[PDB]
C-alpha cells in the first residue's frame, strides 16, 4: 500500500483505490495502473521534474529501500492478475529488485523527488508507474 500527496491530490494504484478516491476523481488512467483524487488537506510530497535513471525505493515486504538502476518510462508487457488481464502497461520503467503485490505504493525517489510508486513485480523484477510527465501535479 501507499501513496503519493501533493497539493490537493492523492496519487494511488488505480487497482487499490477506495471509495472515496473514485468518488473524488480527477483524472484515471486503467494503462497506466494510476488514480488521482483531490483531498482537503495540503500535501508535502515533491514530484521529479527529471530523467534520472538511478533512485531508491521503499519495499514494505523487506521493510527497507532499495538503491536501484531503472529503466526510462515505456510500454511493457505485464502477466494477467487478479486485478488486471495480460495487457501492456505504458509508462512503466522497471528494475531488478524484490517486491511483491502488498509492495504496490512504494515509492520510488531521485535527487529531485517522487518518480513513481511501485506497481508490478516478479522474477526479481520491480516495475514503477511513473509520475514524472504529470505537470499538472504541480499546479
Ligand atoms: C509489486 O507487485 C508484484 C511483485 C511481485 N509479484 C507480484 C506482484 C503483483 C503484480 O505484479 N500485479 C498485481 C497487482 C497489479 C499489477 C499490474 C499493475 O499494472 C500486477
Ligand atoms: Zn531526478
Same mark, same amino acid.
Given at each position: 500500500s501507499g501513496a503519493i500527496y501533493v497539493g490537493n491530490y492523492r496519487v494511488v494504484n488505480r487497482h487499490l483505490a477506495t471509495h472515496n478516491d473514485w468518488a473524488n476523481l480527477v483524472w484515471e488512467d486503467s494503462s497506466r495502473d494510476l488514480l488521482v483524487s483531490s483531498t482537503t488537506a495540503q500535501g508535502c510530497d515533491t514530484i521529479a521534474r527529471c530523467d534520472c535513471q538511478t533512485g531508491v525505493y521503499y519495499c514494505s515486504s523487506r521493510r527497507k529501500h532499495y538503491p536501484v538502476s531503472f529503466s526510462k518510462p515505456s510500454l511493457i508487457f505485464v502477466e494477467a492478475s487478479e486485478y488486471y488481464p495480460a495487457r501492456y502497461q505504458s509508462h512503466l520503467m522497471l528494475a531488478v529488485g524484490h517486491s511483491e503485490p +502488498?509492495?504496490? +505504493?512504494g515509492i520510488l525517489r531521485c535527487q529531485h523527488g517522487v518518480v513513481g510508486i511501485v506497481s508490478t513485480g516478479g522474477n526479481g523484477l520491480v516495475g514503477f508507474a511513473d509520475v514524472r510527465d504529470l505537470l499538472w501535479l504541480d499546479e
Open positions: +502488498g509492495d504496490c +505504493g
